[PDB]
Design an enzyme around this catalytic site. Structure first.
Site, mmCIF file in Angstrom:
data_model
loop_
_atom_site.group_PDB
_atom_site.id
_atom_site.type_symbol
_atom_site.label_atom_id
_atom_site.label_comp_id
_atom_site.label_asym_id
_atom_site.label_seq_id
_atom_site.Cartn_x
_atom_site.Cartn_y
_atom_site.Cartn_z
ATOM 1 N N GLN A 77 0.838 -1.193 0.000
ATOM 2 C CA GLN A 77 0.000 0.000 0.000
ATOM 3 C C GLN A 77 0.876 1.248 0.000
ATOM 4 O O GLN A 77 0.552 2.258 0.625
ATOM 5 C CB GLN A 77 -0.917 0.000 1.225
ATOM 6 C CG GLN A 77 -1.995 -1.067 1.170
ATOM 7 C CD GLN A 77 -2.924 -0.890 -0.020
ATOM 8 O OE1 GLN A 77 -3.731 -1.766 -0.327
ATOM 9 N NE2 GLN A 77 -2.818 0.250 -0.692
ATOM 10 N N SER A 78 1.996 1.161 -0.707
ATOM 11 C CA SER A 78 2.930 2.269 -0.801
ATOM 12 C C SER A 78 2.279 3.523 -1.364
ATOM 13 O O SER A 78 1.819 3.532 -2.507
ATOM 14 C CB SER A 78 4.110 1.879 -1.685
ATOM 15 O OG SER A 78 4.838 3.027 -2.081
ATOM 16 N N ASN A 79 2.241 4.580 -0.559
ATOM 17 C CA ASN A 79 1.676 5.849 -0.998
ATOM 18 C C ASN A 79 2.622 6.387 -2.068
ATOM 19 O O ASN A 79 2.201 6.838 -3.132
ATOM 20 C CB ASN A 79 1.597 6.816 0.182
ATOM 21 C CG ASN A 79 0.651 6.332 1.268
ATOM 22 O OD1 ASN A 79 -0.556 6.209 1.046
ATOM 23 N ND2 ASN A 79 1.194 6.051 2.448
#
Lengths: 341, 341
Positions: A77-79
């Site tokens: 869920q890397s921004n």
């Protein structure tokens, strides 16, 4: 000093707003007056976020030089990657993202966790999302390396962007300008902030705020809440960036250390504890502001903790730095049951 | 100038910004210059959106009198309910949301539609959620009234907030102000917009723009895009709200009809078509701007369709209106498979 001597490319609407969380303040005992600089309300590019501020000083490089692909890296869920995607799109260039296994994908979530949230947006934006299975590390990775070479041999010109932009040469400039901006907003708002609370994992955001605030001799106003759980390597890389960024902007001051609260990164990177969840709730319930279980939640619980233990002087104005990451909240839907009336 | 007469409570950051989607304009043949007023980046209250602009003129009444509960209604992945919950959080009032089933949950998203996205956020903000099986209908609903009476019988003081605030007495004032902003912003831009494209479902948004743009005799510039697939009840409620609002602000001009393109609501409210996905992705791949499957993707595909059939004067400045709603995108991941390069 002088972040001004560096090329900048607009990716945001301008100075991020500052919210007055006066309701969350009373709920916590009215010990302090909490404010929040909304970097989560950055720009129109895929929900914005702290990363966009950083990228503004790296883009010029990409544009002047001749490139074709933007390749970055991060967790599931890397921004970060989600913004490199949006960035690639806006710049009209290809994008390759390396999503590694940085978080122990909770059981009742291993279904959606890999396709419902930030990663989805990267795909929707037409990015070459690549799911790989490696551990968590805030430094240079081998996968990121090979991906680069892959494109090169393919006859392309890849532009590297390390985890969170942090280790990038100009990865620390964006938040230097963040300090200049805060100083200016203090005057227009007629409110001086005694301290600045910000989440820290890969560095640059905190480092930049440290080097930036130093221009006015206020580096110590900073209070970074570790969320990486690897305090050791985290403080070392942050401090390493801080000194480089300082040299860059002309700040002579030498950073030997900074406030890095470690009491909240547990259990580990990407996994919220009972405290995180309580903080997200409290904030959401009191201000209507959303924080995620990976970062903002922990920096928020941290903010809530310090206030509780009367860490700040009675009445102090604390600036909470909301960096974003709320779009990854859908991959943690299981941590928030419905409330009883 | 009859909109300044009504009380207004600050929920947004101020005049919503306008993005110059110049790249998407080039992609689409350079027929027209597309811009986009970002209502999706208007507040720090749980991602913001159009409902919030409407809510600004309704909050005054809530604080004036003595209400304890804020109750609204909408589909499972309703934005309205998500924002009302955030408002409830802010005003310090209690919330109860009715999440009716207006959408035939795609067989692929069945294990997500009621746990992810907007509904998840509402729950986090401590909103009293209620998943009822009633079908789709923009008009008043039974479940709604039952809740008001229930609470009222429990000895509480509820506050009725219809689907999208559309059928609310002041539900149209919100976007009347939007019109004002537009005229002002045209000035600050040194250009004039030839048309305004905006999604349309429950009414008050387009209604408010109509009543408002009318103050300048430009009601015809409005180009609503249906997304309900029930144009009749929609066009009629819109037209109705439009005339109701026009009276409050003074505008005499009565509305008997308006431009409501209904070519893309297919197959129905909540579900997108190949064209929607194409649009959502085109916009996402071109500007980095995210549009949802339910509303903005359609008004976006409509906008794209219209540009093909050369509906606008060459070089026309069309202002797309982004009303947000991207947080529910996690409930439609199934429709977006990783692209190929």
């Amino acid at each position: 000093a002088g972040v001004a001597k560096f090329a900048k490319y607009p990716l945001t609407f301008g100075p991020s707003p500052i919210s007055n969380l006066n309701r969350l303040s009373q709920h916590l005992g009215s010990k302090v007056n909490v404010y929040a600089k909304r970097e989560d309300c950055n720009s129109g590019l895929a929900f914005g976020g702290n990363k966009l501020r950083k990228l503004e000083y790296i883009v010029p490089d990409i544009v002047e030089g001749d490139y074709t692909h933007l390749v970055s890296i991060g967790g599931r869920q890397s921004n970060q990657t989600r913004m490199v995607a949006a960035l690639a799109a806006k710049l009209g260039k290809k994008c390759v993202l390396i999503q590694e296994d940085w978080v122990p994908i909770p059981e009742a979530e291993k279904d959606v966790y890999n396709r419902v949230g930030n990663i989805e947006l990267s795909r929707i934006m037409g990015a070459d999302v690549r799911v790989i299975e490696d551990g968590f590390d805030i430094g240079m990775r081998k996968s990121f390396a090979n991906a680069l070479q892959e494109l090169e041999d393919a006859g392309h010109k890849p532009y590297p962007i390390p985890a969170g932009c942090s280790e990038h040469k100009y990865g620390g400039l964006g938040f230097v300008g963040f300090a200049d901006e805060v100083i200016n907003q203090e005057v227009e708002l007629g409110i001086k902030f005694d301290k600045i609370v910000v989440c820290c994992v890969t560095g640059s955001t905190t480092a930049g705020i440290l080097a930036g605030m130093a221009q006015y001799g206020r580096q110590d106003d900073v209070i970074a809440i570790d969320a990486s759980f690897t305090s050791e390597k985290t403080k070392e890389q942050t401090l390493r960036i801080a000194n480089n960024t300082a040299k860059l902007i002309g700040v002579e001051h030498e950073f030997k250390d900074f406030t890095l609260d470690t009491r909240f990164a547990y259990p580990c990177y990407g996994v919220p504890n009972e405290g995180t969840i309580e903080a997200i709730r409290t904030c959401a319930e009191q201000e209507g502001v959303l924080t995620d279980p990976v970062f903002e939640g922990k920096s928020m619980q941290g903010l809530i903790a310090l206030i509780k233990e009367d860490y700040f002087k009675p009445g102090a104005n604390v600036l909470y730095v909301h960096l974003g990451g709320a779009p990854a909240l859908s991959a943690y839907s299981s941590f928030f049951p419905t409330k009883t009336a």
